[PDB]
């Protein structure tokens, strides 16, 4: 991957679109 994901999935590891944050983008 490209950290399309690795900040994402990972953001998603954080809880995705329901994280305390928002997506990688």
UniProtKB/Swiss-Prot annotation:
Subcellular locations according to the entry: Secreted
Segments crossing the lipid bilayer: none
In this chain, where does the modification Serine amide occur?
25
**Which tissues and organs express this gene's product?**
Expressed by the venom gland.
Function in brief: Venom protein that mimics the incretin hormone glucagon-like peptide 1 (GLP-1). It stimulates insulin synthesis and secretion, protects against beta-cell apoptosis in response to different insults, and promotes beta-cell proliferation. It also promotes satiety, reduces food intake, reduces fat deposition, reduces body weight and inhibits gastric emptying. Interacts with GLP-1 receptor (GLP1R). Induces hypotension that is mediated by relaxation of cardiac smooth muscle.
Family the entry assigns: Belongs to the glucagon family.
Q: What is this protein called?
A: Exendin-4
Q: Which organism is it from?
A: Heloderma suspectum (Gila monster)
Q: What is the lineage of its organism?
A: Eukaryota, Metazoa, Chordata, Craniata, Vertebrata
């Amino acid at each position: 991957e490209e950290e399309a994901v690795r900040l994402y999935i990972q953001w998603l590891k954080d809880g995705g679109p329901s994280s305390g944050r928002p997506p990688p983008s």
